[PDB]
Amino acid sequence: SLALHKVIMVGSGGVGKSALTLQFMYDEFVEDYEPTKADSYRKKVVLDGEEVQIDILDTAGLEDYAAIRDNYFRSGEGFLCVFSITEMESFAATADFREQILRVKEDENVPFLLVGNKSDLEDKRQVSVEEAKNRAEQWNVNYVETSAKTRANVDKVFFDLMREIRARKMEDS
Amino acid sequence: GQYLVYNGDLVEYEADHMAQLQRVHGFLMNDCLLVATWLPQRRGMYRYNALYPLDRLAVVNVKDNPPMKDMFKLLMFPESRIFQAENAKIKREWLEVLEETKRALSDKRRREQ
Numbered sequence A: 001s002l003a004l005h006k007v008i009m010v011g012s013g014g015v016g017k018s019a020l021t022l023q024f025m026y027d028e029f030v031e032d033y034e035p036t037k038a039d040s041y042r043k044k045v046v047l048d049g050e051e052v053q054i055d056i057l058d059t060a061g062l063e064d065y066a067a068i069r070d071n072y073f074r075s076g077e078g079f080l081c082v083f084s085i086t087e088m089e090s091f092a093a094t095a096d097f098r099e100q101i102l103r104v105k106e107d108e109n110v111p112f113l114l115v116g117n118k119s120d121l122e123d124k125r126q127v128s129v130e131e132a133k134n135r136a137e138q139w140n141v142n143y144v145e146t147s148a149k150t151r152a153n154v155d156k157v158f159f160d161l162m163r164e165i166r167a168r169k170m171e172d173s
Numbered sequence B: 001g002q003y004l005v006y007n008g009d010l011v012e013y014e015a016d017h018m019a020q021l022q023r024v025h026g027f028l029m030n031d032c033l034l035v036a037t038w039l040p041q042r043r044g045m046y047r048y049n050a051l052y053p054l055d056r057l058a059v060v061n062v063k064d065n066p067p068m069k070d071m072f073k074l075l076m077f078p079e080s081r082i083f084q085a086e087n088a089k090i091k092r093e094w095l096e097v098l099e100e101t102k103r104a105l106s107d108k109r110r111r112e113q
Ligand SMILES: Nc1nc2c(ncn2[C@@H]2O[C@H](COP(=O)(O)OP(=O)(O)NP(=O)(O)O)[C@@H](O)[C@H]2O)c(=O)[nH]1
Pocket: A011, A012, A013, A014, A015, A016, A017, A018, A019, A020, A030, A031, A032, A033, A034, A035, A036, A037, A059, A060, A061, A062, A117, A118, A119, A120, A121, A146, A147, A148, A149, A150
């Protein structure tokens, strides 16, 4: 059977979790905001020669119950910790998300990628590349800026996340 | 007070390989969701009943994609379950009531506390 890599979109409200997902799933992007409850997408893709399926869970950046949030997290295998480079508060918000992910998954090496979206709005930047790169290094994860609008690195983040998930599976089995 | 908000039949599917499992009946009440499953066995039709508190239940909208249509998923440790509604109308109704009674459950607790 085809391997299945479960990706979870994590990050504050409005950082562009949905935009990235939809851009990746259907090569589309709309400028208008659309609050997310919880959507599940699946797609057949080729990862280094093998046909696999990627499963993405796109949820609201704002969830009332911690128990529900944990049920979202616990179902994933890899995470895309998204924050917007045009809003510093969403960058600060990443530390808690990571802590919750670690607690819930109980593993320091959980497939995780730090993602700074909205790179096409360089003019409005609020978080510096270095700030982000530093946080990633101290968390021992990679950092990558994307733009779900222009597609810059959209495929890269999902495919790289898949590769780390595929690695942990390679060893942990 | 307590009351039956919504209920209906659904077909369960295994979430990872989307294989069809069995028919189930869901009963929505003001603070929990009851799912009744009837699994036939050689000499002992086994039954599985689960109650899911709405303040712990993660409801996910599964987007359509060929081997999948009109489905939504329930997430609650240690389970992940997918259910298919008879048509798009039924699926839409389930998602609306699950969302609305959860909202109602939250604001009901906000006034209290
Ligand atoms: N310029 C630009 N706008 C973006 C980008 N990504 C998202 N947006 C815009 O930012 C807004 C929020 O995006 P959205 O995908 O809904 O964010 P979210 O993280 O899913 N929000 P929620 O958690 O509330 O569902 C939308 O109006 C969207 O068009 C990007 O890379 N560049």
